[PDB]
Amino acid sequence: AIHVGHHTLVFELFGMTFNGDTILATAVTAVIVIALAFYLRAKVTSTGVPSGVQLFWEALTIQMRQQIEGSIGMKIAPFVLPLSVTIFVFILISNWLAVLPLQYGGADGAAAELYKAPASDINFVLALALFVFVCYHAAGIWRRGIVGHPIKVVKGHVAFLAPINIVEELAKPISLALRLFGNIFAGGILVALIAMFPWYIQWFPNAVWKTFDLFVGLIQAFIFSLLTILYFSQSMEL
Amino acid sequence: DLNVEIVAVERELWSGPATFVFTRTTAGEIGILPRHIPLVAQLVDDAMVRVEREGEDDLRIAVDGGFLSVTEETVRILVENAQFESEIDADAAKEDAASDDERTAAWGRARLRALGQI
Amino acid sequence: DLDPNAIITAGALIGGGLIMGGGAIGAGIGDGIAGNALISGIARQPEAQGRLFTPFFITVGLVEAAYFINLAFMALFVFATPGLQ
Amino acid sequence: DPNAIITAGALIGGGLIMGGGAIGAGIGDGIAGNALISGIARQPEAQGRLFTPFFITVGLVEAAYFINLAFMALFVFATPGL
Amino acid sequence: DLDPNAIITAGALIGGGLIMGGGAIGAGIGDGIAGNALISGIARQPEAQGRLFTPFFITVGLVEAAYFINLAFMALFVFATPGL
Amino acid sequence: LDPNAIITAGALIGGGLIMGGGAIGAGIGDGIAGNALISGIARQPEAQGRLFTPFFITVGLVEAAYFINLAFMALFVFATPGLQ
Amino acid sequence: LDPNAIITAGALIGGGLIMGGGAIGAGIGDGIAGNALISGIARQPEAQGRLFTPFFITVGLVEAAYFINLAFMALFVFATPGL
Amino acid sequence: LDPNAIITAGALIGGGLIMGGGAIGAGIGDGIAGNALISGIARQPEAQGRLFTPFFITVGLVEAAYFINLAFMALFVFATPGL
Amino acid sequence: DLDPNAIITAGALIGGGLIMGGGAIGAGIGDGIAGNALISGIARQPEAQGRLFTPFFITVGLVEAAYFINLAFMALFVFATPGLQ
Amino acid sequence: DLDPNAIITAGALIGGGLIMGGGAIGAGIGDGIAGNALISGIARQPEAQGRLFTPFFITVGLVEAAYFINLAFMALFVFATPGLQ
Amino acid sequence: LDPNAIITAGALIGGGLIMGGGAIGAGIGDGIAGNALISGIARQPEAQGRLFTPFFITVGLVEAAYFINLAFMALFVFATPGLQ
Amino acid sequence: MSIFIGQLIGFAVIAFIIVKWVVPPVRTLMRNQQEAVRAALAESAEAAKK
Amino acid sequence: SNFLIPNGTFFAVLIIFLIVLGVISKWVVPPISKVLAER
């Protein structure tokens, strides 16, 4: 079978269900990010040659900066940069960790994954997308006031197209979330499907698919971060 | 027929009626007919211009620093310099091509194209 | 002898699938074309980036709206099927 | 049940209507936006100059789209021949 | 057994849906292309508008006309269904 | 399960398909030819008179097929082959 | 029900698909070829005649395949295979 | 409901789909190739001949797929597998 | 009599097939168009290549979404079919 | 009161027709576009002919590649229908 | 009528749709990308190598979808969900 | 089990490909950035000395 | 099944992310900005 779904380690609290597997995956990604941050702080050396982690972090910051000023300056949105770089590294680590060999057999004839990327769960992508949604909506709010924010978003660039603009205010979150989900969810299916062949034929197609999935995860992380910055700039204007 | 005017910086070279003007602009080979649209283009570094009249042998001219300007009433080729096939000596065209300097090599290549060697 | 709800459901899912096929095609091609325009504009004028967003965001916007409108009605077809009985 | 079959056909027809409308509207808007983007890139000062024809085209395209919307609404809700 | 008119109506609605799908696709795409041409012409030359509408409208006609035809004829499918 | 019901259903489906396809083809072709005409006129107003001669040719090739569709489409629904 | 009714219904649907595909192909191809012809004429009016030789070569070709569909669609609705 | 009857109905609908796809592809590809040829000749009328040779390598290949469709459609309709 | 779940699942499979068809067509067209823009821009001026990767990766992002989102919905059609009874 | 294999084969024929039609459409469009590129290049730079064939063969290759897979899938569908009873 | 028969027929048709769309998208996208690459090589003879790096990415982005869809055929034909 | 072995072989192939082709260039870029910053600091020291 | 509907995990994930964000807010981004400004 394929058993698409089947969240493991599920539990309940305060009358609400929680998926243990996705929570564990996001915890692993978060602890890896925090470990990298601590490693950077330990080996932070402006005067000396920067460490590899310092090179990585400064590369990410320089990128996200460049796009920011290309769209809007720091002083207008100082806090966007940390948000975007976070989102980026978090999603990238979440997607890349999946490359590790954590696929086994459940004795049922169907493969199982010990570490499933959180983006492959609707909860993670919805959390990220709604967090960004609230963040830049509030950013625009106090950029041009509570009263003016709905007016500007409704009128958009051209007032007489007001209805269409409204749909966009609903589209951006969903489009931000679902795409990411899909981008990762396919992999979860694909690898499972790749388990249909024997090992001596399963090794190759899985190799190719995961090799491409690395680039896919990188591209999706970059796209989500850039679109977050871009929407932040859109909401914070004039 | 269209009025071809091959004109250089130092003087005018040739003028008269023509039925076809083939050349190699930077974008690509272009053939101008009597009612071509107005146009301004830059001839390639080693451009060659072939002019065909009504029943007369084509004039093949090796052009350096060429600019083509076509109008509904006249067509002009403003060249930094330009030499006709008859005056072009094959030995120089062969020997100066593929030289150290790009400009001289292009000029030699244009002369060879005018002769036919390319 | 078949459940009327079964036939209605099959029709509703096929209709929603068609709606989303059309919406996906339209959105993908429209966004690709708008992105081609934006990329060409950037290639010609690297500094035009900002001023080119107001056009681009409009186009994508329109395109996206149409697509997402379809999305809504597809849900309407599937989750709350009109005429279901 | 005749009603079941006719209604299923109605939903499928509405789906076709919306699929075609979505394809047409999306691609037409993309093409008009490509034109507007190119015009802005080449002539940044034509912004207001270029809005007029672009919204003419967009309005016509969305008019076709909304006609399809209305007829889908007719099919799904006020299905003839029920 | 089933009422034949049920199958007739279902087929007619499917046909009308196909007609609308094709007409909408054609009209949207053609109108978008004509508008692209008009926008590019205006951008590259400001004051041809007074002339540019003369061909453009024609073109839109040649496009929208077809749409309307579909529209009109689609009524025949949904209301005056042949062999009903 | 009346047979003529199936006959009419198939005929109407086929007619809708042909009408949609003809609409798509006519719309796209008219739009593309109109884009060519509009750009040509924009570059040079004098050519407006000339360009109609080739442009009107293209529409003739395109619309013909569309108007052929309708024709053959009329065959299926109004007089369905194989209908008894 | 009569199987032959199913055969001819499938034939009608197949013929509709054939004719629709032929129509789309012919319309798109003729539109593109005419766009090329119109642009060329606007460019080089004196090449007008010289442009019809390739244009028709495309046209007749684009129509050719289209007409083949007709040459077969009628068969589907008049000589239905397996009837 | 004769089994072979449904087999033939499905085969006819198939054949129709194959023809629709093949006609669409052939028509559009031929139109695009003809557009390239016409634009090339209009820009450079004297190159007409030298343009035909590559133009065929494109067109001669486009219908290579289209005709293939016909072939398999025969296998669909005239000799239907599993009939 | 025929099982209602069987016909419902057949309709769901057809809907998912349409979802994939539309999504893949849109994705292919959009990726091709955006890549054409990127390639033309790089060829015209290689020095600008580094910049073009930013808008280009936007375009694909605005296109792949319209496709991958559909993939998600396709799952909803095939794995958890609404009204499966 | 019907042979299941009949329905299976009808569905397989419909599916294979979709396969082959989509493959033909993609192959034709891609071949035409690549050939347009080649013809424009040859017209503008006749000397470039020897250079242009190498990339063109690649462009067609992939464009034809997909086609043959669909062609190959004929063997899988109209002769080796999976799920055949 | 065994339900699995209807399920398998639906799965076959769905897979046919999946690959039809996948091939249409992949073929057209690869053709467009190759058009860009060929024109670029014609314009700048030596650019060919430096044009592969973007072009392949486009191909990688295109074939991806096709490859993805190529998997679901199995999922539809060899592992049809809800086959029961 | 068997699928686990196949996946392990696939991961080994992926790692081999990465180390063989993508690791050298990323390492080269890292070393280039290190050398650039080293040269910048050396030039700052040289400017102070001057 | 019913993949789209989110569970309580929606909330928990935010916590994790927020925590990570906190670090990037203060202990990653500002030090790197200082380093780049100094350089």
Author numbering:
A (entry chain a): 10 to 247
B (entry chain H): 3 to 120
C (entry chain P), I (entry chain O), J (entry chain M): 2 to 86
D (entry chain Q): 4 to 85
E (entry chain R): 2 to 85
F (entry chain S), K (entry chain N): 3 to 86
G (entry chain T), H (entry chain L): 3 to 85
L (entry chain d): 1 to 50
Lines quoted from the article behind this entry:
The membrane domain of the mycobacterial ATP synthase is embedded in the IPM, with the catalytic F1-domain of the enzyme extending into the bacterial cytoplasm and attached to the membrane domain by a central stalk and a peripheral stalk (PS). As do other ATP synthases in eubacteria, chloroplasts, and mitochondria, the enzyme couples a proton-motive force (pmf) across the IPM generated by respiration to the synthesis in the F1-domain of the enzyme of ATP from adenosine diphosphate (ADP) and phosphate by a mechanical rotary mechanism. The mycobacterial PS is made of two proteins, bδ and b′.
Extensive classification of the data for the mycobacterial ATP synthase revealed the presence of not only the three main states referred to as S1, S2, and S3 but also of substates within them. Substates S1a to S1e are in S1, and S3a to S3c are in S3. Further round from S1b by ca. 2° lie S1c to S1e, which have similar c-ring positions to each other, but there are large differences in the F1 domain and in the PS. The positions of the top of the PS suggest that the order of procession is S1a > S1b > S1e > S1d > S1c. The main differences between the substates within each state are that the positions of the PS and F1 domains vary such that the F1-domain (including the α-helical coiled-coil of the γ-subunit) appears to pivot around the PS during the catalytic cycle. Pivot points are located around residues 59 to 66 in the b-subunit, residues 34 to 41 in the bδ-subunit, and residues 43 and 233 in the γ-subunit. However, alignment of the substates via the “crown” in the F1-domain shows that they have identical nucleotide occupancies and that the position of the γ-subunit is also maintained. Alignment of the substates via the a-subunit demonstrates that the c9-rings and the membrane α-helices of the a-, b-, and bδ-subunits of the substates are in identical positions, as are the ε-subunits, and in some instances the lower part of the γ-subunit. Each nucleotide binding site in the three α-subunits and in subunit βTP is occupied by an ATP molecule with an accompanying Mg2+ ion, while the site in subunit βDP has ADP and an accompanying Mg2+ ion. The sixth nucleotide binding site in subunit βE contains an ADP molecule with neither accompanying Mg2+ nor phosphate.
